[PDB]
Amino acid sequence: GAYTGLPNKKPNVPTIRTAKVQ
C-alpha cells in the first residue's frame, strides 16, 4: 500500500494511505 503519516491516527490522510492513496 503506502501507509504514510501515523503520528497517532490518520492526520491528513484518509485512512493510513490505503483507501484513497491518490
- Grid coordinates standing for 18? 490505503
d(CA 20, CA 4): 12
Phi-psi region of 17 (alpha: psi -120 to 50; beta: other; left: phi over 0): left
d(CA 15, CA 5): 10
d(CA 8, CA 22): 21
Residues 17, 2: contact at Cβ < 8 Å? yes
Q: How was this structure determined?
A: NMR
Query: DSSP per residue over 1-22, as a string?
Result: ------SSS-SSSSSTTTS---
Residue 8 CB burial class (10 angstroms; 0-12, 13-18, ≥19): exposed
- Grid coordinates standing for 12? 491528513
